[PDB]
């Protein structure tokens, strides 16, 4: 419950930041560019923290089993239950990665290791380039 509690508080503050950026964008007059950058960076790094913390506690979330309350009436709130129950993605993202995979399209493994060696080589090359010139 502790992990889900931390997820709750962090997601609540993320939703609060979203409500903020919403009600300062809803104005008919656009504020200064710099305030928009500050709000963007803060909210976006907060989203990063959301992702990282959700990553950290996957085991606690998975272990939990969902069950409706005995006191909760489904006869009158079945629509509300179904609203939270449904999880299928929005369609546009679906065909989005479908076209993405269409465009992308032992052989695969050796290309994978070739990518490994290119990555390592590029990292070493840029380390050497940084070391070549004194930046301090």
């Amino acid at each position: 419950g502790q992990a889900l509690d931390a997820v709750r508080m962090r997601l609540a503050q993320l939703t609060h930041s979203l409500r903020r950026i919403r009600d300062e964008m809803s104005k008919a007059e656009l504020p200064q560019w710099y305030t928009l950058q500050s709000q963007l960076n803060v909210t976006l790094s907060q989203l990063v923290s959301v992702t990282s913390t959700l990553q950290h506690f996957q085991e606690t979330l998975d272990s939990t089993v969902v069950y409706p309350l005995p006191k909760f009436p489904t006869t009158s709130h079945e629509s509300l239950v179904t609203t939270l129950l449904r999880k299928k993605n929005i369609p546009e993202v679906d065909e989005w990665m479908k076209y993405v995979r269409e465009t992308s399209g032992e052989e695969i493994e050796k290309l994978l290791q070739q990518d490994r060696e290119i990555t390592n080589w590029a990292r070493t090359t840029f380390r050497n380039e940084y070391g070549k010139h004194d930046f301090k």
């Binding site: 979330l61 409706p68 299928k88």
Partner: protein, 169 residues
Amino acid sequence: MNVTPLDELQWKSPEWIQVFGLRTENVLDYFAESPFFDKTSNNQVIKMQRQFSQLNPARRQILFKYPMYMQLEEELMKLDGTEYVLSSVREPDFWVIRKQRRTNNSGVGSAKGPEIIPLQDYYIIGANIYQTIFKIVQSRLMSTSYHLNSTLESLYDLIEFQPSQGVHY
């Protein structure tokens, strides 16, 4: 070959509810023909055994309420493995089963009874059947991020810069 996930899989059987109707007595009978009911479960074995013999908090409440549920234990305690048991019922529209597997560890040194371990979640709402929240949360967040990316790229397209003023619109 594209498969729809069984968690979102929803079966409707209008003919069965028209013929028999929705009741706790035949809720397992309603579930029998569904794809989610594995034919390898010991419940089906008990069903053929019964057929051959004929031819030849709320957990305790539902425990004490029905005698067929009793017969379910006295026919299920002998067979260990994947079994289907009822979780809870509120009439006349809501039933949920408890998907658990049993390993009757009768080894020396274990004073506990047979081990019961969950496997899946199944919810019978009306005539429909429903079967991770982590996936829901990550899906919502990723779609939100995609929409945010679209909005921000559009806004950056709207941005115009001049050296003598800075950035304006």
